[PDB]
């Protein structure tokens, strides 16, 4: 049970933290890592059954397994915290697989370095899809340098009502309103990221930190 | 609460789940954990009365803040799941700070990804890493970083010390635990990016080092 209340500043406390850039407290802590291990036992149950290139006995085709195991890429650096938390669950329940990282910004700041993906089952973890143009750009980039067998997306949250290009995820966390999000990875100029619960940010707040880091 | 044993096959086994690469259990993810949270308050309690370059304001010097954050770098890929942990405790604490990540390999060694941070002149910059062995990867990054940013101080936080592996002074100003003087696995320490995913770290049993020899 997580306490959540507001102080006499009209700001939110959550279990005795006050955060007055916060407008409301979309999920906490608790609601978050729920929904994560949910959608790790979904992707679980859907890459076990399958088979892919077989690049540890030289071919052909051979199940998900340690030595051919489901190729995650994760996009840096906002999808870092849920990466962690997600591969840990993936463990739990028994999906081999083995994580590499992009980095994009708003250009390609850093490319992966995994260089045998062709007929593989590739899985991309990002934190949220809204507009849709960031996960249209990297799943082009994924398919055309890598030839994956299969190319999946599973996102912590989804922002529907932002969208300006068709993107679906194929898994999905947290639905999140339409409202710029903070906090479990969430930044605002790097800050934020480290918060256990996602807040919805405080109109006009996205341009406290101006200065380049 | 964790239970650690062997099967009959005399595989270690910690919460129902067989290990069989496992040599030795050196830590659950309780102990793991609570370790992480101790460095963190350690840490916290070092930084928090500090000041260094104002970049907000422009201005000269100004306290430890969401203004002014710690400047944190951490080493991919290995301690990717120890700073995601670690800072948040580091928010629980209450210590404002950024997290920038470089990636380091050998042929020697040379930068595969750089830091995309680029005004860390006169400010604290911790380095976290997952381990330090030899000291030779921390010596590089340390000399890089200072020669590069430039900052107030520069310090380091392992998540583990390999205390016999040395082979370069490098003691890191912040532990969180001490491992045998053997190959470790699990909670981001891999065999060819396998077994990072492990919440506790387990020693290898020296068989198994070359398990995986294909390329990813
Ligand atoms: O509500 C939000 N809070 C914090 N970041 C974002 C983003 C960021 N923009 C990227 C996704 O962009 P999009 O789908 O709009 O192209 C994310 O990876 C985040 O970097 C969109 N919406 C949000
Ligand atoms: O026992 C170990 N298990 C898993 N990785 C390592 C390493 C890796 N080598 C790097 C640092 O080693 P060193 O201090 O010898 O230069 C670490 O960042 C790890 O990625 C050293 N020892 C170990």
Redesign the interface.
């Known amino acids: 049970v997580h306490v959540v209340s507001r102080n006499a500043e009209g700001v939110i406390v959550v279990d005795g933290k006050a955060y007055p850039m916060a407008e409301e407290l979309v999920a906490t802590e608790s609601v978050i890592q729920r929904s994560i291990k949910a959608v790790a036992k979904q992707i679980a149950d859907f890459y076990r059954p399958l088979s892919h290139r077989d690049?540890?006995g030289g071919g052909g085709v051979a199940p998900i397994s340690?030595?051919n195991?489901l190729?995650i890429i994760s996009v840096?650096?906002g999808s870092?915290?849920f990466?962690?938390?997600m591969?840990?669950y993936?463990?739990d329940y028994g999906l081999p697989?083995?994580?590499?990282?992009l980095?994009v910004?708003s250009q390609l700041?850093?490319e992966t370095?995994?260089?045998?993906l062709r007929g593989k089952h590739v899985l991309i973890l990002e934190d949220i899809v809204d507009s849709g143009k960031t996960l249209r750009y990297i799943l082009d980039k994924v398919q055309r340098e890598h030839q994956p067998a299969t190319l999946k997306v599973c996102v912590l949250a989804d922002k529907p009502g932002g969208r300006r290009v068709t993107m679906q995820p194929d898994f999905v966390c947290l639905t999140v309103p339409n409202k710029y999000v903070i906090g479990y990875g969430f930044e605002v100029?790097?800050?934020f990221?480290?918060?256990?619960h996602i807040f919805t940010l405080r109109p006009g707040e996205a341009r406290?930190?101006p200065?380049?880091?």
């Open positions: 690049t540890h340690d030595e195991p190729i840096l650096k870092y915290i990466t962690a938390d591969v840990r993936l463990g697989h083995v994580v590499d990282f980095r910004a700041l850093a370095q995994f260089k045998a100029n790097d800050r990221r480290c918060f256990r406290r930190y200065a380049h880091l």
